[PDB]
Amino acid sequence: MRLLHTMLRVGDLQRSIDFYTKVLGMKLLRTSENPEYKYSLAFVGYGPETEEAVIELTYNWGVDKYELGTAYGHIALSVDNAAEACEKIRQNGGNVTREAGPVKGGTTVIAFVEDPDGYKIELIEEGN
Amino acid sequence: MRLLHTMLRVGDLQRSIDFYTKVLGMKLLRTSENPEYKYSLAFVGYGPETEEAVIELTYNWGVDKYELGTAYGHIALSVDNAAEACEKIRQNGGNVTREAGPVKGGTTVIAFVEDPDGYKIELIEEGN
Numbered sequence: 269m270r271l272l273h274t275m276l277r278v279g280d281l282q283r284s285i286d287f288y289t290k291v292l293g294m295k296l297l298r299t300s301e302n303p304e305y306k307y308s309l310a311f312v313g314y315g316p317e318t319e320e321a322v323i324e325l326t327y328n329w330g331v332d333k334y335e336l337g338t339a340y341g342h343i344a345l346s347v348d349n350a351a352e353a354c355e356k357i358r359q360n361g362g363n364v365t366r367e368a369g370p371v372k373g374g375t376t377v378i379a380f381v382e383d384p385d386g387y388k389i390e391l392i393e394e395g396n
Numbered sequence: 397m398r399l400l401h402t403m404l405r406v407g408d409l410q411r412s413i414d415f416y417t418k419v420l421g422m423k424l425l426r427t428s429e430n431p432e433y434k435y436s437l438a439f440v441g442y443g444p445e446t447e448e449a450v451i452e453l454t455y456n457w458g459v460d461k462y463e464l465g466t467a468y469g470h471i472a473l474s475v476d477n478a479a480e481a482c483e484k485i486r487q488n489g490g491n492v493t494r495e496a497g498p499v500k501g502g503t504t505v506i507a508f509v510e511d512p513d514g515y516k517i518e519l520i521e522e523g524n
């Protein structure tokens with residue numbers, strides 16, 4: 269058994285794809301449409317779905333906003349360069365909610381940002 | 397870069413821990429408590445944090461209820477037998493919302509369930 273993906277509903281498919289890929293470094297793995305039910309999906313990740321967990325973005329035709337709620341927390345992603353990522357995010361449609369810097373009571377550099385739909389993203393500058 | 401984890405706030409830490417480990421077959425990877433911010437965490441997954449994406453269960457002291465909202469979708473997990481998992485889940489603190497069965501215009505077997513806090517979980521099955 270394995271963790272496959274986390275699904276998030278977004279207000280604008282392409283805008284989200286653009287964000288995850290161009291800003292966060294992910295790749296568009298596949299996309300699909302469902303005419304019957306009027307929704308489109310996009311899977312974004314850092315590697316193949318067969319090997320790792322990815323993100324499933326759902327766009328319901330004609331729906332551009334949802335109620336975020338208080339239950340869902342965030343998704344944490346490893347980051348190559350936290351400071352730089354924050355910059356890219358700042359200038360590329362996102363918000364930086366916690367500037368890059370050592371975590372409290374630690375040395376590991378972390379940051380918090382928001383995607384285009386306001387979803388919280390935690391960035392962690394991390395056998396063999 | 398990689399997907400590290402998906403964080404979800406839960407109303408009862410042990411209740412969630414029990415569900416993810418005993419029912420879903422995950423392992424309790426680690427726990428922590430933070431007196432300043434008043435919360436406790438539990439990381440559950442199918443593999444170590446260095447190898448896979450996991451779930452971060454967050455319990456805010458004295459907070460037993462949240463608003464799920466309509467934005468967050470779900471987490472998808474692979475299972476050896478969707479039907480068996482559904483029955484185990486329905487009898488152990490969970491709820492089956494979509495009985496195990498093939499996807500319309502498909503052969504892939506899937507089911508949708510809910511955890512103890514109402515979080516949606518998609519189960520995707522991997523000559524009787």
Ligand SMILES: [Zn+2]
Pocket residue numbers: 343344390401403452
């Ligand atoms: Zn986290």
Ligand SMILES: [Zn+2]
Pocket residue numbers: 273275324470471472518
């Ligand atoms: Zn899904």
